[PDB]
Amino acid sequence: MLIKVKTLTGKEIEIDIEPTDTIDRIKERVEEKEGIPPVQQRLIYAGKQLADDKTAKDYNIEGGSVLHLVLAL
Ligand SMILES: [Zn+2]
Numbered sequence: 438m439l440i441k442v443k444t445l446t447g448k449e450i451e452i453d454i455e456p457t458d459t460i461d462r463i464k465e466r467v468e469e470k471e472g473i474p475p476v477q478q479r480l481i482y483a484g485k486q487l488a489d490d491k492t493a494k495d496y497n498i499e500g501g502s503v504l505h506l507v508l509a510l
């Protein structure tokens with residue numbers, strides 16, 4: 438399922454993920470496309486920061502969902 442990750446500079450990154458990916462795996466797919474290290478990414482969805490060890494499925498993320506990226510390190 439394809440999701441959008443919006444940054445503070447207004448960039449909108451399309452990332453195709455698996456519903457079974459952990460949020461840390463999502464950060465890694467973000468790193469493969471854009472080069473931003475996973476350790477510096479805070480991803481927000483449903484008004485809260487997502488935990489690395491939970492799955493997209495755990496947050497009920499769906500096709501077309503928009504996550505927000507804040508840089509943090
Ligand atoms: Zn997909």
Ligand SMILES: [Zn+2]
Nearest residue numbers: 443503504505
């Ligand atoms: Zn927004």
